[PDB]
């Protein structure tokens, strides 16, 4: 479909018969516009006290993100976890609740196209708990740019249990905005990602929010092929089979290769 799908080598798996079928992916974002003809939202929950409906995306964020998961893993079961409000901001508690819901709800993949500058013990316990449970936890690295020799990587992405996804363009080049550091795991396409928008729309968005779902989507592709495989197995598969870009501080392991990861 869109360039980022080809880039990650997704199509090669679609042809072979691997589309993410029977994989449960939670999008912990501003909701998903379930009304979108293309989007099949299987369920969800809201943790935003003022925004009761998970299936309503007042931002556009969550709908775009969900769209990306679906283009990579078209047969995957999408779950909308509303943690962010119309403004794009959310409480750490709302987020924790969203992680907890995903665990309790037997999610296979968590997508967190979100990040903050500071962490919490409650945050780390939650993410680490998702991992202990067998969930593949995906998060954007952040859009912090550089800070000399300092890690720019936001939370929950900073955490080792969480796959930290940075951004590349269609030329395999690091996006200027892309958070850097030892904590950066993988690179996925995040420059001008054309996806689903609320109210039967499509539009381009840039950021690590865009890169993350490509990995969340890639993870669902591997689980469709290897149903038996642990989160640990999925993650290793992804990280170990990458297209090596520059330095690890900037690129991590490089670009994901869904085709090589699926063996």
């Amino acid at each position: 479909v869109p360039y980022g799908v080809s880039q990650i080598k997704a199509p090669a798996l679609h042809s072979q018969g691997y589309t993410g079928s029977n994989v449960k992916v939670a999008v912990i974002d501003s909701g998903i516009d379930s009304s979108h003809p293309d989007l099949n939202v299987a369920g969800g929950a809201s943790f935003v006290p003022s925004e009761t409906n998970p299936f309503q995306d007042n931002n556009s964020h969550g709908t775009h993100v969900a769209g990306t998961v679906l283009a990579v893993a078209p047969s995957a079961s999408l779950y909308a976890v509303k943690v962010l409000g119309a403004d794009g901001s959310g409480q750490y508690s709302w987020i924790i609740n969203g992680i907890e819901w995903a665990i309790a709800n037997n999610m296979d993949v968590i997508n967190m196209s979100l990040g903050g500058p500071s962490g919490s013990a409650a945050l780390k316990a939650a993410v680490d708990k998702a991992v202990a449970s067998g969930v593949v936890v995906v998060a954007a690295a952040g859009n912090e740019g550089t800070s000399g020799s300092s890690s720019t990587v936001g939370y929950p992405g900073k955490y080792p249990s969480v796959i930290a996804v940075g951004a590349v363009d269609s030329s395999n080049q690091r996006a200027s905005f892309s958070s850097v550091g030892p904590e950066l795991d993988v690179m996925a396409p995040g420059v001008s990602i054309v996806s689903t928008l609320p109210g039967n729309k499509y539009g381009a968005k840039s950021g690590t929010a865009m890169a993350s779902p490509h990995v969340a989507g890639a993870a669902a592709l591997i689980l469709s092929k290897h149903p038996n495989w642990t989160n640990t197995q999925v993650r290793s598969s992804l990280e170990n089979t990458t297209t090596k870009l520059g330095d690890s501080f900037y690129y991590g392991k490089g670009l994901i290769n869904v085709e090589a990861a699926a063996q």
Partner: peptide, 4 residues
């Protein structure tokens, strides 16, 4: 936490 903010949208990425």
């Amino acid at each position: 936490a903010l949208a990425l």
